[PDB]
């Protein structure tokens, strides 16, 4: 795989840039977003979780579109006050439950290092 752990504290620097392949090789699920919430990285452990199709998905609105269970102050408003205010770094359990058997997760959210998008990561719990 890649050699990298949920919730490691320079994980925005080893990730910084990462291809889709790469991505691919990590041990948790790893959604990068842009600030409106529109899907530009979904990996394949993500997929595995959540039943989705990484290609089918990257292009598509995660809290509109994907993921309307997030769309929540719990989820989504965490997300967009990080946007806001262009600093994001939380840790939170959660249920994903839309057309899906209800699945109990960690969720890592983490502004990326450069530029101006957003981290979603994902492991079971
Ligand atoms: C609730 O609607 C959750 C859905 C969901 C979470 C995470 C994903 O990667 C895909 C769907």
Redesign the pocket.
């Known amino acids: 795989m890649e050699h990298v752990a949920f919730g490691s504290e320079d994980i925005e620097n080893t990730l910084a840039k990462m291809d889709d392949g790469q991505l691919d090789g990590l041990a948790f699920?790893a959604?990068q977003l842009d600030g409106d919430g529109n899907i530009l990285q979904?990996n394949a452990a993500?997929g595995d979780?959540?039943g989705?199709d990484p290609k089918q998905?990257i292009g598509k609105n995660?809290f509109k579109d994907?993921?309307?269970?997030?769309d929540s102050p719990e989820f989504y408003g965490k997300f967009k006050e990080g946007v806001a205010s262009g600093n994001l770094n939380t840790m939170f359990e959660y249920t994903?439950?839309?057309q899906?058997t209800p699945t109990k997760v960690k969720v890592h959210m983490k502004k990326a290092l450069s530029g101006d998008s957003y981290w979603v990561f994902?492991k079971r719990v």
């Open positions: 699920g959604i979904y993500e979780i959540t989705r998905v995660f994907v993921a309307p269970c997030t994903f439950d839309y899906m994902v």
